[PDB]
Amino acid sequence: HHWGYGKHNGPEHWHKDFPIAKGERQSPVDIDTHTAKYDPSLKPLSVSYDQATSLRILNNGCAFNVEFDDSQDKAVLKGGPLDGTYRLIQFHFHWGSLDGQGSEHTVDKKKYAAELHLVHWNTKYGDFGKAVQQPDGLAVLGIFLKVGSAKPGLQKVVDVLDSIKTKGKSADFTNFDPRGLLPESLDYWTYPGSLTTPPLLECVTWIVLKEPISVSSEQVLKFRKLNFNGEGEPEELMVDNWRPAQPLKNRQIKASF
Numbered sequence: 001h002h003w004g005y006g007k008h009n010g011p012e013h014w015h016k017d018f019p020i021a022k023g024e025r026q027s028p029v030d031i032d033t034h035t036a037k038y039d040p041s042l043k044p045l046s047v048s049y050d051q052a053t054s055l056r057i058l059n060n061g062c063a064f065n066v067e068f069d070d071s072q073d074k075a076v077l078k079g080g081p082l083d084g085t086y087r088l089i090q091f092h093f094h095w096g097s098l099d100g101q102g103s104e105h106t107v108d109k110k111k112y113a114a115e116l117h118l119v120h121w122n123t124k125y126g127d128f129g130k131a132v133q134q135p136d137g138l139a140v141l142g143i144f145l146k147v148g149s150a151k152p153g154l155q156k157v158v159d160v161l162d163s164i165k166t167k168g169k170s171a172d173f174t175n176f177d178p179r180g181l182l183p184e185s186l187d188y189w190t191y192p193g194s195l196t197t198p199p200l201l202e203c204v205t206w207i208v209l210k211e212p213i214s215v216s217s218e219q220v221l222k223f224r225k226l227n228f229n230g231e232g233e234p235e236e237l238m239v240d241n242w243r244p245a246q247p248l249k250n251r252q253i254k255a256s257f
């Protein structure tokens, strides 16, 4: 794909091919914690990952995706602002070149080192590609990463990155438990938005956890050794693969706490 994160094809350029980039419900956004309102109508969030079946990890030239078997309700998200059942299809991260940037969402304008997106699709639409055409097709669980203590549950991801350095490379990645990437609290903010990469479809209910997870400098450093390019091409470190905050326009962010 043409688009990217370079100064010639980055986020400021996307609108030329994807005019929805200047749409009414684009993501990410800044979460103003003093404007977000507690919503007692929200039901408890249910993260049901015990039967998760990971398959593979893929460098797709933009991030790396850990892919799951979504042929059955094996790892689902329910509750919270959601109606129905949303199946985990993949997770990926966005991260920076420096520890002071990398997240897509911001919290009172604070940028985190990275942001994990666990992507789920609404089973009432039958498959992911149909779901992304619907305003309630996806539910993305967003989790901030800050640099501190190592995250043990991330280390298996870190250790395979050497095997998917360049675009198009994949590796088997079975028996990975995504529960190890969750913080202790499931307190979140929620709002209607979009994919944060082209095609930027406005199909996401965003659920952004308040509590970050901590990862070590060594761990995030390993993310930064990935490459955007394909093998045998000049090296372009995979860093700063984040879209900045977009206008909130006619939306309200709700808090679960």
Ligand SMILES: [Zn+2]
Residues within 6 Å of the ligand: 092, 093, 094, 117, 196
């Ligand atoms: Zn993402």
